Design a protein around this ligand. Sequence first.
Ligand SMILES: [Cl-]
Length: 369
Amino acid sequence: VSPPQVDPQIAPPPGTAGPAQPMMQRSECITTSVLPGTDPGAVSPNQLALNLSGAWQHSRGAGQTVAVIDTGVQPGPRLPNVEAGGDYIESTDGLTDCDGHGTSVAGLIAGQPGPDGFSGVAPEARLISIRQNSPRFAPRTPGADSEATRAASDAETLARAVVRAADMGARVINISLVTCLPADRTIDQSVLGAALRYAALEKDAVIVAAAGNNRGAACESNPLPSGTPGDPRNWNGVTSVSIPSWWQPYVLSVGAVDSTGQPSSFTMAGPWVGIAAPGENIVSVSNAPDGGLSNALPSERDRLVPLTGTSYAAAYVSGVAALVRSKFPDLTARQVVHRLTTTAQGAARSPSNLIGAGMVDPVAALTWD
Ligand SMILES: [Cl-]
């Protein structure tokens, strides 16, 4: 197991939308809800950890377009700033979210302030929603439904969606969904690699991906740095590949921290992790018809649980990237990634396989010389 490398003979795919085969909805749609006993309208400690108040004195993300490659984004009063980017599941415009996830992610990135303590990181940014996946759907033809087959199908649409996002003018491309494969069964991803390279270099997009959560295949943390000469981050020891995070250097892979900046218990360790952001007790926008604030989803036997995960951490980082690109519009994607990582809270330590350079620091990123 070694860091992946593009095959220069393999072209990026087209950005055509649509599923590879017809899909059918297998599970009822879900909306995010308010967890009883909470006050979602209070300013989240996650915002305070990031000092978004301080950041907004430098930038609110004006002029930036962020693509949300996710489960769709439901427009509403807190998300009036969402553009259709299409659908790889059905034939919608990307503005239907049957899962809640894309909406929560979009809200963190560029949700609007309102009559409460909630705001997106970059509320003056514009969003493009591309629905690239949904676990509520499966192929209409009930064929092989294996981890391998699902993962390959997911990579195939992800690569197209990345090209589509870049070609639609996205400056930041957010990939909060994660697919993992065991290392002994990771197949050629040359097309996905080609797509990510196209978007990151030729189209100069900052691509941000969630690192994954422990427990395709179930994601599992990889062994930590082990002092191997020439392999300080322990690529050699990887057993569980997080996609597209492992596609360094094109993708900034984001781990989750608690509100104090410590690695979240569930954050997936890997040698690709570059940075972190808050991933616990998330409050964002709902895909329910009112489009208000939510902070929970149903778990077993329909009991509500908080929103947690690296998906939300990635979203925060995408929002911060939009702030940085608005303030410094001439920086390349590589320069923007360098700025984010070199100013993160743990940048002066060797990178962590849990949190990379540590929790993103928006004000530091916006003021560093
Ligand atoms: Cl704040």
